[PDB]
C-alpha cells in the first residue's frame, strides 16, 4: 500500500510540475516559440538528447555570405558548416572568484570544402575543426585543428613507432553502437519547407566520397576522430595536433582569423548568442520530457502495484 | 558493517571498482562505483567524496532510471536522475573504462549540494578553470571532471527541481533499496577497497625493488 501511495503521489507531483512548466510559457495562449537561427542555418535535435547540430552550406566559396552579399547603396569550392552544440554551460566565477566571466558555453564547428586539391574527399579530405566559446556573449576560438585522412591513418598505424595508439585502437575495437534518435527540426523559416533532408544528403555525399576514396579502410577512424558527441572523439582530436595557442599567435593573424570566421565564413556573434539561447530553450524543452518520463514511470509502478 | 538486504557485491583487485546488485522479480537495481585514487574524505568528517551510480530497471515501465548519488557520513544525496529507453545492460553500466549511454543527459539538478559546499569553502571537483590543463589525465572522472559522468561533464542544469518534488522523487526511489543503509555500506566498502587495493599496489612496488 505504501508503494502504491508513494508512486501515485510522485505521479501527481510530476503532473502538477509539467502543468506549471507549460503554464510558465503561456504568453496569453501562445506557447513560447524557439529562437530563430540566422539566415540559411537549419538546426536538428535528437529527441531526449543533450545536443543539437546545425548545418549550413554555401554553394559558392564565400561570395554567398551575407557580408559579401550586402554591398548595398572560377567557381571556387563550395563550403559546408556543421556546428555541434551540447548542453554544457557553467559559471567559472563560482569555482574561483578570481575570473570575471559569468557564462562559458562550448560548441564545435567543422568546416569542409567540397568540389563545385587536398580539401576534396578524394585527396585526404582535409577539413578544419574549430572549437568556440561563448563568454558573456562573446565568441572566441579555443582551438583550430586541420584534420585529415592522413592523420586518421597515422593514428591507427604510426602514432607510436609501428603500431599506433594502443589506446585509440582499443577505442576503435569497442566503438559502441549507434542508436537512431527521432530528429526534431528547428530550421530557419525561409528554408523550413524547401528541403528537409539536405543535411542528410550532404553528410551522405561526404561519407561516401571519403569511404570510396583512398584511406578507405581508415575512414572509420576518421569518423570517430570527427565524432563531436563522443568522449573518444575528443580524445582522438587531442591525440591529433591541437592548434597553436591563439593568444600566443600574432595580433594581426588573430585579427584576420576572427575576420574570416565572423564575416567571410559566416559564423558570427549573432550565431553564437543564438547557440546559447537555443541551448537554454532546448534544455527547457527536454525538462518537459523528463517530467513526462517520471510521470510515466510512477504511473506504471502504481498500475502494476 | 553489514550488506543491505538482498545485495551481492562484485569487486576484483586492481579494478578500483565495485558493483553491488539485487534483482526483484519485477525490478532490478545495480549500484556501481570506482573509489578514487586520491585520499578519501574521512567518514568522521574532520579529498574526493565517494559518489556512485544506481541503475533501477523497471521492465513494466520500459525505462531505466540512472541515479547519480553520493554518500556523506553514511547517508546519501541523489544529485541527479535520468531515464533510458531500454532495460539495464552491461554497455549501459559504466563498469569498465567505457561510459554508459552518451549524448542523453537531462537531469534537472535535484539538489543544491554543490552550491551548499561552496559556502563552507570546500574546494570541490574542478581545481583548475582551464579544461585542457585538467585533461592531461583523460578517461578519469575523478581527476578530469569535464569528461566525468558523475560530475555531469561540468554542466550545471538550468532547472533546479522544486523541493516538494525532489523529496517525493527521493522517497519514491528509496523504496527500491537505494536507502541510507545502502549508502553507508557503499561508503564502508569504498574505504575498505581503497585501503586493500593500495596495500596490494604498495606490495607490488616493494617487490620489484
Amino acid at each position: 500500500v505504501s508503494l502504491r501511495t508513494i508512486a501515485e503521489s510522485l505521479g501527481a507531483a510530476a503532473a502538477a510540475e509539467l502543468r506549471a512548466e507549460v503554464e510558465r510559457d503561456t504568453r496569453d495562449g501562445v506557447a513560447a516559440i524557439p529562437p530563430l537561427p540566422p539566415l540559411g542555418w537549419r538546426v536538428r535535435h535528437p529527441s531526449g538528447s543533450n545536443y543539437f547540430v546545425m548545418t549550413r552550406t554555401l554553394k559558392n566559396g564565400v561570395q554567398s555570405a551575407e557580408l559579401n552579399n550586402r554591398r548595398y547603396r572560377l567557381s571556387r569550392a563550395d563550403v559546408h558548416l556543421t556546428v555541434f552544440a551540447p548542453f554544457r554551460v557553467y559559471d567559472p566565477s563560482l569555482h574561483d572568484p578570481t575570473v570575471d566571466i559569468c557564462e562559458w558555453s562550448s560548441f564545435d564547428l567543422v568546416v569542409q570544402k567540397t568540389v563545385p586539391l587536398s580539401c576534396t574527399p578524394q585527396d585526404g579530405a582535409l577539413s578544419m575543426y574549430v572549437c568556440l566559446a561563448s563568454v558573456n556573449s562573446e565568441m572566441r576560438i579555443r582551438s583550430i585543428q586541420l584534420l585529415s585522412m592522413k592523420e586518421a591513418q597515422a593514428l591507427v598505424e604510426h602514432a607510436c613507432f609501428g603500431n599506433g595508439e594502443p589506446l585509440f585502437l582499443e577505442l576503435l575495437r569497442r566503438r559502441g553502437r549507434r542508436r537512431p534518435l527521432v530528429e526534431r527540426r528547428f530550421d530557419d523559416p525561409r528554408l523550413r519547407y524547401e528541403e528537409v533532408a539536405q543535411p542528410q544528403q550532404v553528410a551522405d555525399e561526404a561519407a561516401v566520397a571519403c569511404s570510396s576514396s583512398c584511406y578507405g579502410p581508415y575512414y572509420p577512424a576518421f569518423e570517430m576522430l570527427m565524432d563531436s558527441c563522443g568522449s573518444a572523439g575528443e580524445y582522438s582530436r587531442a591525440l591529433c595536433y591541437g592548434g597553436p595557442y591563439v593568444s600566443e599567435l600574432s595580433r594581426e593573424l588573430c585579427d584576420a582569423l576572427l575576420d574570416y570566421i565572423k564575416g567571410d565564413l559566416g559564423v558570427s556573434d549573432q550565431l553564437c548568442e543564438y547557440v546559447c539561447q537555443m541551448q537554454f530553450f532546448l534544455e527547457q524543452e527536454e525538462y518537459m520530457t523528463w517530467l513526462g518520463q517520471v510521470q510515466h514511470v510512477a504511473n506504471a509502478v502504481s498500475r502494476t502495484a | 558493517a553489514h550488506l543491505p538486504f538482498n545485495f551481492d557485491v562484485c569487486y576484483e583487485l586492481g579494478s578500483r571498482e565495485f558493483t553491488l546488485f539485487s534483482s526483484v522479480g519485477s525490478t532490478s537495481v545495480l549500484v556501481f562505483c570506482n573509489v578514487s585514487s586520491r585520499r578519501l574524505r574521512s567518514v568522521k568528517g574532520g579529498r574526493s567524496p565517494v559518489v556512485f551510480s544506481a541503475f533501477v530497471s523497471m521492465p513494466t515501465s520500459g525505462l531505466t532510471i540512472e541515479a547519480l548519488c553520493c554518500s556523506s557520513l553514511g547517508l546519501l544525496v541523489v544529485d541527479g536522475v535520468s531515464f533510458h529507453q531500454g532495460p539495464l545492460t552491461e554497455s549501459m553500466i559504466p563498469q569498465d573504462a567505457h561510459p554508459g549511454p552518451e549524448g542523453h543527459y537531462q537531469g534537472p539538478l535535484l539538489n543544491q549540494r554543490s552550491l551548499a559546499e561552496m559556502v563552507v569553502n570546500t574546494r570541490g571537483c574542478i581545481t583548475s578553470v582551464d579544461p585542457f590543463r585538467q585533461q592531461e589525465s583523460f578517461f578519469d572522472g575523478h581527476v578530469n571532471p569535464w569528461n566525468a559522468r558523475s560530475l555531469r561533464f561540468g554542466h550545471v542544469p538550468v532547472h533546479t527541481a522544486k523541493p516538494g518534488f525532489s523529496d517525493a522523487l527521493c522517497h519514491f526511489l528509496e523504496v527500491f533499496g537505494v536507502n541510507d543503509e545502502l549508502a553507508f555500506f557503499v561508503e564502508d566498502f569504498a574505504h575498505l577497497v581503497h585501503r586493500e587495493e593500495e596495500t596490494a599496489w604498495t606490495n607490488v612496488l616493494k617487490t620489484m625493488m
Binding site: 529527441s47 531526449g48 527521432v182 513526462g292 518520463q293 | 515501465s61 525505462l63 531515464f83
Partner: peptide
C-alpha cells in the same frame, strides 16, 4: 499534445 508526441517518439513506452 506534447504527451502524445512523446508517445510517438517512443520516449514513453
Amino acid at each position: 499534445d506534447k504527451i502524445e508526441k512523446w508517445k510517438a517518439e517512443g520516449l514513453l513506452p
